[PDB]
């Protein structure tokens, strides 16, 4: 079951890469593409994201793209930049100046064929294609709004595909222009329809830890990224090492989807480490469980206390006794049943894997579908309305040829989506 | 590639022009035969300071930039000069009879003669470009040719380049080096004229620059000389994302798209520190903290208002040298608790923060203290309409008793096209005043 990747704009292309970077690792494979590991463990699954090669060589299935470059350059400069496909690397010249428009209707549309191409070539390699999975943000021109239009061609050509979504989410604690609002509200209308699943990655969240809980005065993207390319690879464990829970894509979405369009993922991860701060003492099992359900931990900037969990997927990592881990995981669900909807039945499921993360003899990787991620969209919502009730800022999207109805939509879907979140909530 | 090209028209244009790419040269290390030792690409190249200049297979590199004026003393001192073999003769353009400070001949009488040779001379460059961005356009507000050839050009180049970014340069008039008592004619007819065609105009007033050089660098009787050196560092830093490479750099488009909120809402306020002389800036280093903290005091202001009694839209902090995030962000924290610093309900208030590593330079024998560290703050406030409403002030009353206005009209020009000019002013500061009110 293979999955294709692809990675789209600056933010896509900077998490895409450190993610490589990380399951390369976890999967033996070095820079050059050869394998150097000493488990079994590390290839029995190593089809669903690398493609064989010469020479017993393993070539990530990943697709590159951008409107610009620049962020490409460094990519394929970066530590493990030569491992990508070379022909993958599909970018313009011209840019989307976070402009979601430029992404979607022209600079893009121009593009986005090219794009295609390599994605329909990597498809037809595929014993057996599962679905996509899309590294985005949804803040900007091309991740936003490219990645959107790629989504729905992606639909159009494979259906009966899964589509999959890491979508970075804007925050003005993270702010690269006053426009992000506009960008994202755009884009979760398209997600809403055209994905399957969605991580959704704040980027107030990942700033709050950053600052709050590991203590880092000013926090880069490079901080950052390294709580997304850790989440990432906790999220994507049960798919790329054995297991019976929650192995591709499709299982995954049948067992946390109870809603097509509630689909909306808050990530989770214990224990947090900022980069290069060595941890001594491993956590016990109680710690990882606590940990991982705190809102503090939570990548995604809503307090789960504010809604029910319709779904969990949970992922312990490294050697421990699964006896505990059950006992653990049961005495949240017992202790705290209150945040969990009682009309689904058992609707905490959790998956064991030897291998631990670099750096961390266990971690614990948590996947949340709560009614509480209505407050993430409600924020955004908030924002957009705020500029939107003066038409501030739209002179660049009508000018790409954008009607203010497209927003006026654009807007009430979003809100919609929040109110269905509540309607749960309250059942 | 993103290549700009630079517009140099009148002699306000041209000599901040000399200003600019002389302190580019210093700052890229280019001599002035146009050879570039630290380029090992010879003939071509990809690299940040390849945006203004071109390469000959010689080695040379040549500035993408045109020099106009309807009269040609102004521009033979180029032709004569220190920095002569850094223009092919063809970037340097010349009438034989100026503008008389009269719009109408800048626009109708005179430029109409030489404008096409102009735009095949500006293709010339652009054809060189592989991906060209836009254009940068310096000016007079006051002058015949700065204001009205400008307008002219400025007109047909929408017409050649589509929705091609225009940027302007507009230099505001000032009693103190007035050349004319009609520029207030001429700088309402070029503000109407253009102001479809801009996508951004930073507007230099001479009063506040002169006021600078006088207070801050002790100048008794500052001269053009001593105001475009000044004028040219604005420039620089404005330029300077464009023209440098790093990992904090930020785009000037990405500004940009902050800075304008609406189409006719395009005129960013400028702040320039530390302006300061050798003999103060001795044994004194002025702080990321103190020089963000001069940007939010009027004195240091490229046009005079009082953004104090204004709304903000957008506050963009451009630096240059040793500077560090985590200084700006503690000297913002603190500025923002004790400054007078609002916004419009409708925007959101955060700083948007952009570092070039390159630190700043000076020309030999200039007035300016050589800093370790600088910053341009561009902002968007109500207030910069107090520039439109001085200048409208002093059309009204000439205009009330038609003074002067028989010059225009003997060059074609009807009364119409003053009304009409002086309507979109008022609606212009109208508008400022629109985006200031709170929501219902
Ligand atoms: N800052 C600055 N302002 C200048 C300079 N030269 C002229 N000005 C101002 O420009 C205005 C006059 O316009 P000019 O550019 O000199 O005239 P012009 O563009 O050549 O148009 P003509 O009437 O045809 O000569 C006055 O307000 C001057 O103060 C200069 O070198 N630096
Ligand atoms: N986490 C993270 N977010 C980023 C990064 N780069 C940009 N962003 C966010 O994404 C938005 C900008 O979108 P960007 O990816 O730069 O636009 P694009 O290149 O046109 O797709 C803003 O909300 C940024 O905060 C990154 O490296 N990491
Ligand atoms: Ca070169
Ligand atoms: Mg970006
Ligand atoms: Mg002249």
Known sequence: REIVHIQAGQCGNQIGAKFWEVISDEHGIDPTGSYHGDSDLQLERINVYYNEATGNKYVPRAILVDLEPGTMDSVRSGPFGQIFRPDNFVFGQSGAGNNWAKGHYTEGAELVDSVLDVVRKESESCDCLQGFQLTHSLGGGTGSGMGTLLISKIREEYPDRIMNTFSVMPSPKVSDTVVEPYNATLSVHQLVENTDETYCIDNEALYDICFRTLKLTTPTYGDLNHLVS?????????????????????????????????????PGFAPLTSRGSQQYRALTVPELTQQMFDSKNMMAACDPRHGRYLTVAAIFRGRM?????????????????????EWIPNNVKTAVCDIPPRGLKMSATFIGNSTAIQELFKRISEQFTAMFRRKAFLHWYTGEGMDEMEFTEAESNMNDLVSEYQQYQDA | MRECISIHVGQAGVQIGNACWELYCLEHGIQPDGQMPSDKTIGGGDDSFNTFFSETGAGKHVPRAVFVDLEPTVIDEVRTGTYRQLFHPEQLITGKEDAANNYARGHYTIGKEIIDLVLDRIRKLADQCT?????????????????????????????????????????????????????PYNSILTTHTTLEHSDCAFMVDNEAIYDICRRNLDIERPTYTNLNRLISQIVSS?????????????????????????????????????????????????????????????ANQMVKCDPRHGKYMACCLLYRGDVVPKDVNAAIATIKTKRSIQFVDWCPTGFK???????????????????????????????????????????????????FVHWYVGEGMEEGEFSEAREDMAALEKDYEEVGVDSV
Request: aromatic share 10%; proline share 6%.
């Open chain 1, 230 to 266: 850790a989440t990432m690879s906790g999220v994507t464990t049960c798919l790329r090492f054995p297991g019976q829970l929650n192995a591709d894509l499709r299982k995954l979405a049948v067992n946390m989807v109870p809603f097509p369009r509630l689909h909306f993922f808050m």
């Open chain 1, 321 to 341: 006794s699964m006896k505990e881990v059950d006992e653990q995981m049961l005495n949240v669900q017992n202790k705290n049943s209150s945040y969990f909807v």
């Open chain 2, 131 to 183: 991906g060209l961005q836009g254009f940068l356009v310096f000016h007079s507000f006051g002058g015949g040719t700065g204001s009205g050839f400008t307008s002219l050009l400025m007109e047909r180049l929408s017409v050649d380049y589509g929705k091609k970014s225009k940027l302007e340069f507009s230099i505001y008039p000032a009693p103190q080096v007035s050349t004319a008592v009609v520029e």
């Open chain 2, 238 to 298: 404005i330029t300077a994302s464009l023209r440098f490479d790093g990992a904090l750099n930020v785009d000037l488009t990405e500004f940009q798209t902050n800075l304008v909120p609406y189409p006719r809402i395009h005129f960013p306020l400028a702040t320039y520190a530390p302006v300061i002389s050798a003999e103060k800036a001795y044994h004194e280093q002025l702080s990321v903290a103190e020089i963000t903290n001069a940007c939010f005091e009027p």
């Open chain 2, 353 to 403: 923060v952009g570092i070039n590593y390159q630190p700043p330079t000076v020309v030999p024998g200039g007035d300016l203290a050589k800093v370790q560290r600088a910053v341009c703050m561009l902002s968007n406030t109500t207030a910069i309409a107090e520039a439109w409403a001085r200048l409208d002030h002093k059309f009204d009353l000439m205009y009330a008793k038609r003074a």
